[PDB]
Design a protein around this ligand. Structure first.
Ligand code: NI
Length: 341
């Protein structure tokens, strides 16, 4: 049955709630982004109205074959009326097409649902600046002070400089990047750009990227692996066995692999600066785990909440254990006492 934290009080709405069958009293299903834990349950047989971004609606139609008549895409940063309730979609700084949803309830309550997000000071100057928010449904994925990570910009600088050095030293090295969902496209696009190559990938992955409105994409990606020196593979194949096997398939064009796994967090973060990251190496294969996050660090999440000053916080992540729930509730109280709301 649908958990309470996916239901919007005072409305007929649910958020990211497609795996529970017909939710009783739900008149419109919202989808924050195209990640499988959130869309689980959608297909060509869904016949209720789904509300989402334009990019998410491209993916629903082309990848899951949802019929057009049931997809209701909304423009960002624009006041819209859904089943009699004002809503606004905001950029969530997560993966392409990901949104936060502002609900303006008929009784005067204002609710923000962050979906999955990576908090940023640029959010402090959207339509959020313009009114009070009473209830926050918060992506608490990394809600503990051990979770620090570098900016995305620092991580991309490291990856470009590492790849450019390796291929300039050895023009016969191949660069491989792992993927299993949309998101983190900057990693592989930035590396292909510095090298003067397209990114090569499977037809299924090319199709998915063609749904994303990324400018000049026909210029950066391809299904012709032979013409590319940056290849995308499934995340599961980024290990020594999988990479040895791939290198065999390339027919002696290449004699070394440099591979990247963009993880969220790993405990090497508590000790090591980005500058200091080193790969795991076996023979002519090296694998780098880089801390490229599309979720808030602890400090980014704290700053957002202390700026927004909500009256009530509802976590949406790590809610399954009493220890996790009590840990989060204790940080929420700290933040409120320190800031004075
Ligand atoms: Ni996500």
């Amino acid at each position: 049955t649908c958990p309470f934290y996916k239901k919007i009080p005072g409305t007929g709405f649910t958020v990211d709630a497609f795996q529970y069958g017909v939710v009783e009293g739900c008149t419109a299903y919202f989808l924050t982004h195209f990640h499988s834990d959130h869309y689980a349950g959608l297909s060509k047989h869904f016949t209720f109205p789904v509300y989402c971004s334009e990019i998410t609606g491209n993916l629903l139609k082309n990848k899951l074959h949802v019929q057009e008549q049931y997809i209701h895409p909304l423009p960002l940063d624009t006041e819209c009326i859904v089943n009699g309730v004002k809503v606004v979609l905001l950029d969530a700084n997560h993966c392409p097409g990901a949104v936060m949803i502002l609900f303006y309830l008929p009784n005067g309550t204002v609710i923000l649902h962050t979906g999955d997000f990576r908090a940023d000071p640029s959010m402090e100057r959207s339509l959020l600046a313009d009114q009070k928010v009473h209830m926050l449904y918060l992506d608490t994925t990394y809600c503990s002070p051990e979770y620090t990570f570098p900016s995305q910009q620092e991580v991309i600088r490291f990856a470009i400089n590492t790849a450019f050095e390796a291929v300039t030293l050895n023009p016969h090295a191949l660069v491989v990047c792992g993927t299993y969902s949309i998101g983190k496209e900057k990693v592989f696009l930035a590396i292909a750009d510095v090298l003067g190559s397209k990114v090569g990938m499977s037809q299924e992955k090319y199709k998915t990227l063609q749904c994303l409105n990324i400018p000049e994409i026909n210029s950066l990606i391809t299904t012709d692996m032979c013409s590319s020196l940056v290849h995308l593979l499934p995340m599961m194949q980024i290990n020594f066995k999988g990479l040895q096997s791939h290198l065999k398939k390339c027919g002696g064009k290449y004699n070394q692999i440099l591979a990247f796994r963009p993880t969220g967090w790993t405990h090497s973060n508590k000790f090591t600066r980005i500058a200091d990251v080193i790969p795991q190496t076996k023979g002519n294969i090296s694998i780098y785990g880089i801390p490229y996050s599309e979720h808030s660090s602890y400090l980014e999440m704290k700053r957002f909440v202390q700026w927004l000053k909500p009256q009530k916080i509802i976590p949406t992540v790590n809610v399954g254990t009493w220890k996790s729930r009590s840990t989060m509730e204790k940080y929420f109280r700290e933040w409120k006492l320190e800031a004075g709301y």
